[PDB]
Amino acid sequence: SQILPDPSKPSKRSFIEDLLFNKVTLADAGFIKQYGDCLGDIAARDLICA
Amino acid sequence: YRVVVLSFELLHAPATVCGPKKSTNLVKNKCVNFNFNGLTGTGVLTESN
Ligand SMILES: *[C@@H]1O[C@H](CO)[C@@H](O)[C@H](O)[C@H]1NC(C)=O
Numbered sequence: 498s499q500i501l502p503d504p505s506k507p508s509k510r511s512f513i514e515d516l517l518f519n520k521v522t523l524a525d526a527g528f529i530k531q532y533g534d535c536l537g538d539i540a541a542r543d544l545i546c547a
Numbered sequence: 548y549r550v551v552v553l554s555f556e557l558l559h560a561p562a563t564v565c566g567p568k569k570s571t572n573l574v575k576n577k578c579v580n581f582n583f584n585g586l587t588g589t590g591v592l593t594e595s596n
Contacts, residue, residue, distance in 0.1 A: 543576050543591055543593065545591070
C-alpha cells in the first residue's frame, strides 16, 4: 500500500512518492525559483516573464 | 585665458539640473520606451506595493 499508486488523489503518486516530492524543494534557489514564481503570479496580467 | 570647468555626477536621484525636453503623460500597462531623467529603456510600466 505504501508503494502502490493511490486512487484517492488526482495525482497517481504513491505515499512514498509523495514524500519524495515533498522532500526535494526549491526554497532557497535563485533564478529557478524566481522563474517559477511568475507561473504562480498569473492573477496579474501583462506578465511577460519569458 | 578665462577657463571654466564643469563637473557633475551621473545616475543619481535629485535631478534638479536637467535639459529642456518636454515631458509626456503616463499610459500604464503598455510596452513603451520610457525615459526617466536620462535613464531610458523599453518595457511595461505597472503599479507596485
Ligand atoms: C492566460 O489567459 C488565461 C485566460 O485569459 C488566464 O486564466 C491565465 O492566467 C493567463 N496566463 C497568464 C500567464 O497570464
